[PDB]
CSV table of C-alpha atoms and ligand atoms in Angstrom, one decimal:
chain,number,residue,atom,x,y,z
A,793,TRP,CA,18.7,26.2,-65.3
A,794,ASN,CA,20.3,24.3,-67.5
A,795,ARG,CA,20.9,21.4,-65.2
A,796,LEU,CA,17.9,21.8,-64.4
A,797,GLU,CA,16.1,21.7,-68.2
A,798,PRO,CA,17.7,18.2,-68.8
A,799,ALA,CA,15.8,16.7,-66.1
A,800,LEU,CA,12.3,18.0,-67.6
A,801,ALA,CA,12.3,15.9,-71.3
A,802,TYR,CA,9.8,13.6,-69.7
A,803,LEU,CA,7.4,16.9,-70.1
A,804,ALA,CA,5.3,18.6,-73.3
A,805,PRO,CA,7.0,21.8,-74.4
A,806,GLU,CA,4.5,23.9,-72.8
A,807,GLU,CA,4.9,21.7,-69.8
A,808,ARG,CA,8.7,23.1,-69.8
A,809,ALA,CA,7.2,26.8,-70.2
A,810,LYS,CA,5.4,27.0,-67.3
A,811,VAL,CA,8.2,24.6,-65.2
A,812,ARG,CA,10.4,28.1,-67.3
A,813,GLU,CA,8.3,30.7,-66.2
A,814,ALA,CA,8.4,29.6,-62.6
A,815,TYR,CA,11.5,29.0,-62.1
A,816,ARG,CA,12.1,32.6,-63.5
A,817,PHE,CA,9.3,33.7,-61.4
A,818,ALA,CA,11.4,32.1,-57.9
A,819,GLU,CA,15.1,33.9,-59.4
A,820,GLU,CA,13.2,37.2,-58.8
A,821,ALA,CA,11.6,36.2,-55.9
A,822,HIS,CA,14.4,34.6,-54.5
A,823,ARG,CA,16.7,37.8,-55.8
A,824,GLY,CA,19.3,38.4,-53.7
A,825,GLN,CA,18.4,35.6,-51.0
A,826,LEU,CA,21.6,33.8,-49.2
A,827,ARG,CA,20.7,30.2,-47.5
A,828,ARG,CA,23.3,29.3,-44.1
A,829,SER,CA,25.8,27.8,-47.6
A,830,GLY,CA,26.9,31.1,-49.1
A,831,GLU,CA,25.1,30.2,-52.1
A,832,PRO,CA,22.5,32.3,-53.4
A,833,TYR,CA,18.9,30.8,-52.1
A,834,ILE,CA,17.0,29.8,-55.8
A,835,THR,CA,19.4,26.8,-55.3
A,836,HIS,CA,17.1,25.4,-52.9
A,837,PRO,CA,14.0,25.4,-55.0
A,838,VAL,CA,16.1,24.6,-58.1
A,839,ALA,CA,17.1,21.4,-55.9
A,840,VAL,CA,13.4,20.4,-54.4
A,841,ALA,CA,12.4,20.7,-58.6
A,842,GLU,CA,15.2,18.1,-59.4
A,843,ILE,CA,14.1,16.0,-57.1
A,844,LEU,CA,10.4,16.4,-58.5
A,845,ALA,CA,11.6,15.8,-61.9
A,846,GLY,CA,13.7,12.9,-60.8
A,847,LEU,CA,10.5,11.6,-59.5
A,848,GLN,CA,9.0,12.8,-63.7
A,849,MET,CA,6.3,14.5,-60.6
A,850,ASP,CA,3.5,16.6,-62.4
A,851,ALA,CA,4.2,19.8,-64.3
A,852,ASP,CA,2.5,21.3,-61.7
A,853,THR,CA,4.6,19.7,-59.1
A,854,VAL,CA,7.9,20.1,-60.5
A,855,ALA,CA,6.6,24.4,-61.0
A,856,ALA,CA,5.6,24.1,-57.3
A,857,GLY,CA,8.5,23.0,-56.3
A,858,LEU,CA,10.1,26.2,-57.2
A,859,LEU,CA,7.7,28.3,-55.6
A,860,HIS,CA,7.4,26.4,-52.4
A,861,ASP,CA,9.2,29.6,-50.9
A,862,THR,CA,8.1,32.3,-52.4
A,863,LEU,CA,5.2,32.8,-49.1
A,864,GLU,CA,7.6,31.3,-47.1
A,865,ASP,CA,10.7,32.6,-46.9
A,866,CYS,CA,10.3,35.2,-49.6
A,867,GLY,CA,7.3,37.5,-49.9
A,868,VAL,CA,3.3,36.2,-49.6
A,869,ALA,CA,1.9,36.0,-53.3
A,870,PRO,CA,-1.2,33.9,-52.3
A,871,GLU,CA,-3.5,35.6,-55.6
A,872,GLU,CA,0.4,36.3,-57.7
A,873,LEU,CA,0.5,32.6,-58.2
A,874,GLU,CA,-2.8,31.8,-58.7
A,875,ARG,CA,-2.7,34.3,-61.2
A,876,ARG,CA,0.3,32.9,-63.1
A,877,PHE,CA,0.8,29.6,-62.1
A,878,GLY,CA,-3.3,29.0,-61.5
A,879,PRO,CA,-5.2,28.0,-58.9
A,880,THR,CA,-3.6,23.7,-58.2
A,881,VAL,CA,0.1,25.4,-58.7
A,882,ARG,CA,-1.4,28.2,-55.9
A,883,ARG,CA,-2.9,25.3,-54.1
A,884,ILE,CA,0.7,22.5,-53.7
A,885,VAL,CA,2.0,25.9,-51.9
A,886,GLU,CA,-0.1,27.2,-49.7
A,887,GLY,CA,0.2,23.5,-47.1
A,888,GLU,CA,-3.0,20.9,-46.5
A,889,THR,CA,-1.5,18.3,-45.7
A,890,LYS,CA,-4.9,17.4,-43.6
A,891,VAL,CA,-4.5,14.2,-41.8
A,892,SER,CA,-4.3,10.4,-43.1
A,893,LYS,CA,-8.4,9.3,-43.1
A,894,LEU,CA,-8.4,6.2,-45.5
A,895,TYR,CA,-9.7,4.6,-42.7
A,896,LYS,CA,-13.2,6.6,-43.6
A,897,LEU,CA,-13.5,5.1,-47.0
A,898,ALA,CA,-14.1,1.7,-45.3
A,899,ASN,CA,-16.7,3.1,-43.3
A,900,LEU,CA,-18.6,5.4,-46.2
A,901,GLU,CA,-18.6,2.9,-49.4
A,902,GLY,CA,-21.8,5.8,-51.1
A,903,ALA,CA,-21.0,11.5,-59.2
A,904,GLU,CA,-19.7,15.1,-59.3
A,905,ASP,CA,-18.6,14.8,-55.5
A,906,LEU,CA,-16.5,11.4,-56.0
A,907,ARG,CA,-14.8,12.7,-58.7
A,908,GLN,CA,-13.4,15.4,-56.5
A,909,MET,CA,-12.5,13.1,-53.9
A,910,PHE,CA,-9.9,11.7,-56.3
A,911,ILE,CA,-9.1,15.0,-57.8
A,912,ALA,CA,-8.4,16.8,-54.0
A,913,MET,CA,-6.9,13.3,-53.1
A,914,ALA,CA,-3.8,13.7,-56.1
A,915,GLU,CA,-3.6,17.4,-54.7
A,916,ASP,CA,-3.2,16.1,-51.5
A,917,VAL,CA,-0.3,13.3,-52.0
A,918,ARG,CA,1.9,15.9,-54.1
A,919,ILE,CA,1.1,18.5,-51.4
A,920,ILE,CA,3.0,15.7,-49.6
A,921,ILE,CA,5.5,15.4,-51.9
A,922,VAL,CA,7.0,19.0,-52.1
A,923,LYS,CA,7.3,19.4,-48.1
A,924,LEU,CA,9.4,15.7,-48.5
A,925,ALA,CA,11.1,17.1,-51.6
A,926,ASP,CA,12.2,19.8,-49.4
A,927,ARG,CA,12.9,18.1,-46.4
A,928,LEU,CA,15.0,15.7,-48.1
A,929,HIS,CA,17.2,18.2,-49.6
A,930,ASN,CA,17.8,20.3,-47.0
A,931,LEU,CA,19.3,17.3,-44.8
A,932,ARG,CA,21.5,16.7,-47.5
A,933,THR,CA,22.7,20.1,-47.3
A,934,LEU,CA,22.6,20.0,-43.3
A,935,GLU,CA,26.9,20.1,-42.5
A,936,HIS,CA,25.8,24.1,-42.9
A,937,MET,CA,23.8,24.0,-39.5
A,938,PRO,CA,24.8,24.4,-36.3
A,939,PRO,CA,25.3,20.7,-34.3
A,940,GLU,CA,22.1,21.0,-32.3
A,941,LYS,CA,19.5,22.4,-35.4
A,942,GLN,CA,20.7,19.1,-37.0
A,943,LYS,CA,19.4,17.1,-33.8
A,944,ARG,CA,15.5,18.7,-33.9
A,945,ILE,CA,15.6,18.9,-37.8
A,946,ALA,CA,16.8,15.0,-37.9
A,947,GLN,CA,14.4,13.7,-34.9
A,948,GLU,CA,11.0,15.9,-35.9
A,949,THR,CA,11.8,14.3,-39.6
A,950,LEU,CA,11.9,10.8,-38.0
A,951,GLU,CA,8.4,11.8,-36.6
A,952,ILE,CA,6.9,13.1,-39.3
A,953,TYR,CA,8.7,12.5,-42.6
A,954,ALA,CA,9.8,9.8,-43.0
A,955,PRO,CA,6.5,7.8,-41.7
A,956,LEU,CA,4.8,10.9,-44.4
A,957,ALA,CA,6.7,9.3,-47.3
A,958,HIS,CA,5.8,5.5,-46.2
A,959,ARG,CA,2.4,6.2,-46.9
A,960,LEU,CA,2.8,6.9,-49.7
A,961,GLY,CA,4.6,4.1,-50.3
A,962,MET,CA,7.9,6.0,-51.3
A,963,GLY,CA,11.0,3.4,-50.1
A,964,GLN,CA,13.5,5.1,-51.4
A,965,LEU,CA,13.0,8.9,-49.8
A,966,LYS,CA,11.5,6.7,-46.6
A,967,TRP,CA,14.7,5.3,-46.8
A,968,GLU,CA,17.4,8.5,-47.5
A,969,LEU,CA,15.3,10.6,-45.3
A,970,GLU,CA,16.1,7.6,-42.4
A,971,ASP,CA,19.7,7.4,-42.6
A,972,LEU,CA,20.5,11.1,-43.1
A,973,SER,CA,18.2,11.7,-40.3
A,974,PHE,CA,20.6,9.0,-38.4
A,975,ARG,CA,23.3,10.5,-39.0
A,976,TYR,CA,23.0,13.8,-37.7
A,977,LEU,CA,20.8,12.4,-34.9
A,978,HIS,CA,23.8,10.0,-33.4
A,979,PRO,CA,26.6,10.5,-35.3
A,980,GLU,CA,29.1,8.0,-33.2
A,981,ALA,CA,26.5,5.0,-33.9
A,982,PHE,CA,26.5,6.6,-37.6
A,983,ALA,CA,30.0,6.2,-37.9
A,984,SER,CA,30.8,3.1,-36.0
A,985,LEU,CA,28.3,1.1,-38.3
A,986,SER,CA,29.6,2.7,-40.9
A,987,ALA,CA,33.1,1.9,-40.8
A,988,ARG,CA,32.3,-1.6,-40.3
A,989,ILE,CA,30.3,-2.0,-43.3
A,990,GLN,CA,33.0,-0.6,-45.1
A,991,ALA,CA,35.6,-3.6,-43.7
A,992,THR,CA,32.3,-6.7,-44.7
A,993,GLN,CA,31.5,-4.5,-47.4
A,994,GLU,CA,34.8,-4.2,-49.2
A,995,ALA,CA,35.4,-7.8,-49.5
A,996,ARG,CA,31.6,-8.8,-50.2
A,997,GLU,CA,32.0,-6.5,-53.0
A,998,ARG,CA,34.8,-8.0,-55.2
A,999,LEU,CA,32.0,-11.3,-55.4
A,1000,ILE,CA,28.8,-8.8,-55.2
A,1001,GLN,CA,30.0,-7.7,-58.7
A,1002,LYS,CA,31.3,-10.7,-60.4
A,1003,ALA,CA,27.6,-12.0,-59.4
A,1004,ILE,CA,26.0,-8.7,-60.7
A,1005,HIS,CA,28.0,-9.1,-64.3
A,1006,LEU,CA,26.9,-12.6,-64.3
A,1007,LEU,CA,22.7,-11.9,-63.5
A,1008,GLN,CA,22.9,-8.6,-65.6
A,1009,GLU,CA,24.2,-10.7,-68.9
A,1010,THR,CA,22.1,-13.5,-67.9
A,1011,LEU,CA,18.7,-12.1,-68.6
A,1012,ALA,CA,20.2,-9.8,-71.7
A,1013,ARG,CA,21.7,-12.3,-73.4
A,1014,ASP,CA,17.4,-13.9,-73.3
A,1015,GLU,CA,16.0,-13.0,-75.9
A,1016,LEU,CA,12.0,-13.9,-74.4
A,1017,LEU,CA,12.8,-12.2,-71.5
A,1018,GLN,CA,14.0,-8.9,-73.0
A,1019,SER,CA,11.0,-9.5,-75.3
A,1020,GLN,CA,8.4,-9.3,-72.7
A,1021,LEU,CA,10.5,-6.5,-70.5
A,1022,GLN,CA,11.3,-2.7,-71.1
A,1023,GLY,CA,14.4,-2.7,-68.5
A,1024,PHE,CA,16.2,-4.4,-65.8
A,1025,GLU,CA,18.4,-3.5,-63.0
A,1026,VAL,CA,20.2,-5.7,-60.5
A,1027,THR,CA,22.2,-4.4,-57.7
A,1028,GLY,CA,23.6,-5.2,-54.9
A,1029,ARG,CA,22.0,-5.6,-50.8
A,1030,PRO,CA,20.6,-1.8,-50.4
A,1031,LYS,CA,21.9,-1.5,-46.7
A,1032,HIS,CA,19.5,0.8,-45.4
A,1033,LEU,CA,21.5,1.6,-41.9
A,1034,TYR,CA,18.7,3.4,-40.0
A,1035,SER,CA,16.4,0.3,-40.1
A,1036,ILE,CA,20.0,-2.0,-39.8
A,1037,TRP,CA,21.2,-0.5,-37.2
A,1038,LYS,CA,17.0,-0.9,-35.8
A,1039,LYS,CA,17.0,-4.1,-36.0
A,1040,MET,CA,20.6,-4.3,-34.0
A,1041,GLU,CA,18.6,-3.5,-30.6
A,1042,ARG,CA,15.4,-5.0,-31.5
A,1043,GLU,CA,16.7,-8.1,-32.5
A,1044,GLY,CA,19.7,-8.3,-29.9
A,1045,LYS,CA,21.5,-9.2,-33.2
A,1046,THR,CA,25.5,-8.5,-34.1
A,1047,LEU,CA,26.0,-6.6,-38.1
A,1048,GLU,CA,27.4,-9.8,-38.6
A,1049,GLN,CA,24.5,-12.0,-38.0
A,1050,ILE,CA,22.4,-9.4,-40.8
A,1051,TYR,CA,24.9,-9.5,-43.0
A,1052,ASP,CA,25.6,-14.0,-42.4
A,1053,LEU,CA,23.9,-14.4,-46.3
A,1054,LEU,CA,25.1,-12.5,-49.9
A,1055,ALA,CA,22.4,-11.2,-51.4
A,1056,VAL,CA,21.8,-9.9,-54.9
A,1057,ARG,CA,17.8,-7.6,-55.8
A,1058,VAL,CA,16.7,-8.5,-60.0
A,1059,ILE,CA,14.3,-4.9,-60.1
A,1060,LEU,CA,12.6,-5.6,-64.0
A,1061,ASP,CA,10.0,-3.5,-65.6
A,1062,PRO,CA,8.3,-4.9,-67.4
A,1063,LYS,CA,6.7,-3.6,-70.6
A,1064,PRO,CA,3.7,-1.9,-70.9
A,1065,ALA,CA,-0.2,-4.3,-71.4
A,1066,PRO,CA,-3.4,-2.8,-72.5
A,1067,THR,CA,-5.2,-3.9,-69.6
A,1068,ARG,CA,-4.8,-4.3,-65.8
A,1069,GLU,CA,-4.6,-7.8,-65.8
A,1070,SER,CA,-3.0,-9.1,-69.4
A,1071,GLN,CA,-0.5,-6.2,-66.6
A,1072,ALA,CA,-0.3,-8.5,-63.6
A,1073,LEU,CA,-0.6,-11.8,-65.7
A,1074,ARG,CA,3.1,-10.2,-67.6
A,1075,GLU,CA,4.3,-8.9,-64.1
A,1076,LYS,CA,4.8,-11.9,-62.6
A,1077,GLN,CA,5.2,-14.6,-66.0
A,1078,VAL,CA,8.8,-12.4,-65.3
A,1079,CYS,CA,9.5,-12.9,-62.6
A,1080,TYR,CA,9.7,-17.0,-62.5
A,1081,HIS,CA,11.3,-17.0,-66.5
A,1082,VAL,CA,13.8,-15.0,-64.2
A,1083,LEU,CA,14.0,-17.9,-61.2
A,1084,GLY,CA,14.4,-20.1,-64.5
A,1085,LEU,CA,17.1,-18.6,-65.5
A,1086,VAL,CA,19.1,-18.0,-61.7
A,1087,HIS,CA,18.5,-21.2,-61.0
A,1088,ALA,CA,20.3,-22.5,-64.9
A,1089,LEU,CA,22.7,-19.9,-63.9
A,1090,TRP,CA,23.7,-21.0,-59.8
A,1091,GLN,CA,22.7,-24.2,-58.5
A,1092,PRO,CA,19.2,-24.3,-56.0
A,1093,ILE,CA,19.7,-24.7,-52.8
A,1094,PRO,CA,17.2,-27.3,-51.4
A,1095,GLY,CA,13.5,-25.5,-50.4
A,1096,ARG,CA,15.0,-22.1,-50.3
A,1097,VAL,CA,12.0,-20.8,-52.8
A,1098,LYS,CA,10.2,-18.0,-51.1
A,1099,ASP,CA,7.3,-17.0,-53.0
A,1100,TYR,CA,6.4,-13.7,-51.9
A,1101,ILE,CA,4.5,-13.3,-55.4
A,1102,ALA,CA,1.9,-15.8,-54.6
A,1103,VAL,CA,1.8,-15.2,-51.3
A,1104,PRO,CA,2.3,-11.6,-50.3
A,1105,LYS,CA,3.8,-10.5,-46.4
A,1106,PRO,CA,0.4,-8.8,-44.5
A,1107,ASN,CA,1.9,-5.6,-45.8
A,1108,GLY,CA,1.5,-6.4,-49.6
A,1109,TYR,CA,4.9,-7.9,-50.2
A,1110,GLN,CA,5.5,-8.8,-53.7
A,1111,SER,CA,9.2,-10.9,-54.4
A,1112,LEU,CA,10.2,-14.1,-55.5
A,1113,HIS,CA,13.4,-15.2,-53.3
A,1114,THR,CA,16.1,-18.2,-53.6
A,1115,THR,CA,19.1,-19.0,-52.3
A,1116,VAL,CA,21.8,-20.4,-54.8
A,1117,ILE,CA,25.1,-21.6,-54.5
A,1118,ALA,CA,27.3,-18.8,-56.7
A,1119,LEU,CA,30.7,-18.2,-57.1
A,1120,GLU,CA,33.0,-19.7,-54.9
A,1121,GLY,CA,30.4,-22.0,-54.0
A,1122,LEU,CA,28.9,-19.1,-52.0
A,1123,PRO,CA,25.5,-19.4,-50.7
A,1124,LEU,CA,23.6,-16.2,-53.1
A,1125,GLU,CA,20.4,-15.1,-52.3
A,1126,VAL,CA,18.6,-13.6,-55.4
A,1127,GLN,CA,15.0,-11.2,-55.0
A,1128,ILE,CA,13.5,-11.2,-58.6
A,1129,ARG,CA,10.8,-8.4,-58.4
A,1130,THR,CA,9.5,-6.3,-60.7
A,1131,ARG,CA,9.4,-2.4,-60.4
A,1132,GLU,CA,5.5,-2.0,-59.2
A,1133,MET,CA,6.9,-4.6,-56.2
A,1134,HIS,CA,8.8,-4.4,-53.1
B,15,CL,CL1,13.5,-5.2,-74.8
B,16,MN,MN1,12.8,25.1,-48.4
């Protein structure tokens, strides 16, 4: 509990009390039970609640994360969970993923039934996230599984869960799900690619960190930018090992051909705006402002500005790109985007 409690800071005291009541209930239902690792079962729903609390999930969602296995793993409490934690917690813990039927919106344009549509959908999204948080944690703790069972769940994850994560637009979940699945599915391919990156990545890492520090300090020191900004993040390339190995087979490319240009990402969280439009305006103003700061810092390579804010990819991808001449006279790609954008 002392590990979970700090992550629940974003919730109102009464919302946190519901989560403690849920933890203390799971603590009872899972009393005596053990995982594959000799660890007590309660550690699993806690870790799942931690994943959800890190994502700043709804109070009922975090609570439902502590109770998601009180029906499956140990005991039956369908009317008990409704009696103790409400119907919405009971609904999430019961499984109702239904199916992707967004194409039904397009054909059906035509209230209390359209109001309930939102509350049913948002409840249906919450079900998927808990399943995802659960699966992500299991994969993390997959070292205590026979090497066959390990391969059956990595494939299920790649067929079912990583695509569900994609539907929900949870790229950070999808990334980790794919890469942990890759590790256990083809370990020999994983260890070959991992150690190969740990050769180029260490040499690159010195420059990437110099660049990171230079961009982070340049942005924090700009007065006007920080005024319309809540915060920012300057990272190196993300390194999606499954989507990197996936591309090597498709494109018939070497890994040396992928890392053929040092890259840096700038994720900007702007200050909140009263209306939806004054937010979209703020969201873009900030991005070109960074492009200017970047071009003032490092020399821009002619015709390497890729504006995907103005011309988004068919999947809706927005971001500003520019290849510059940075440290040691090297072509460095910069990608400027907000938290909302991908
Ligand atoms: Cl600020
Ligand atoms: Mn579970």
